């Protein structure tokens, strides 16, 4: 069914865990089959598990950790802050992001928007 707020906090937290270990198969299975991802928010969205797989394939040594609790609503949505560590121009950099997700009635991510820009990038 439409995930409760507690359920949303556990799913959002698990998607960051899966990113962190680079488990592309498990990541893409968290998404609805026709989910849309906008990352960064403002850019054209990508649609469908195929494209979202390709995204993570290309994007993912990269680490990612929640930097605070997940915030969850009563209508299936929530938002979380996290930090991605990865290489930029040959040095270790960090990028601060917040992801906003809405879930469908099967508990899968229907949409994700990832808020970040170069102002959030640090060497």
Ligand X SMILES: C[C@]12CCc3c(ccc4cc(O)ccc34)[C@@H]1CCC2=O
Residue 80 interacts with a copy of itself (CB under 8 A): yes or no: yes
CB-CB contact of 115 with 40 (8 Å): yes
Per-residue contact flags (x/-) with ligand X for residues 15 to 54, judged by CB under 6 A: ----x-------------------x---------------
Out of 14, 50, 75, 88, the only residue in the binding site for a copy of itself (CB under 8 A) is 75
The least CB distance from residue 68 to ligand X, in Å, is 15
Out of 13, 54, 86, 100, the only residue in the binding site for a copy of itself (CB under 8 A) is 100
Footprint (CB under 6 A) of ligand X, residues 52-111? 59, 62, 64, 84, 86, 95, 97, 99
Q: Pairing relation of β-strands 71-72 and 63-66?
A: unpaired
Instruction: Quote the CA–CA distance of 37 and 56 in Å, as a whole number.
Output: 11
Helix, strand, coil in percent for the chain, rounding step 5: 30, 40, 25
Residue 114 interacts with ligand X (CB under 6 A): yes or no: yes
Instruction: Quote the CA–CA distance of 60 and 58 in Å, as a whole number.
Output: 6
User: 3 Cβ partners below 8 Å, 6+ apart?
Assistant: 11, 76, 103, 107
Contact set with a copy of itself (CB under 8 A): 5-6, 9, 40-42, 67-69, 71-75, 77-81, 96-98, 100, 115-120
């Amino acid at each position: 069914n439409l995930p409760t707020a507690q359920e949303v906090q556990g799913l959002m937290a698990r998607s960051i865990e899966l990113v962190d270990v680079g488990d592309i198969e498990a990541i893409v299975q968290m998404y609805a089959d026709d989910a849309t991802v906008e990352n960064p928010f403002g850019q054209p969205p990508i649609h469908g598990r195929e494209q979202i797989a390709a995204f993570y394939r290309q994007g993912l040594k990269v680490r990612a950790c929640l930097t605070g609790p997940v915030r969850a609503s009563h209508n299936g949505c929530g938002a979380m802050p996290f930090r991605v560590e990865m290489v930029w121009n040959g040095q270790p950099c960090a990028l601060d992001v917040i992801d906003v997700m809405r879930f469908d009635e099967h508990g899968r991510i229907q949409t994700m928007q990832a808020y970040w820009s170069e102002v959030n990038l640090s060497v």
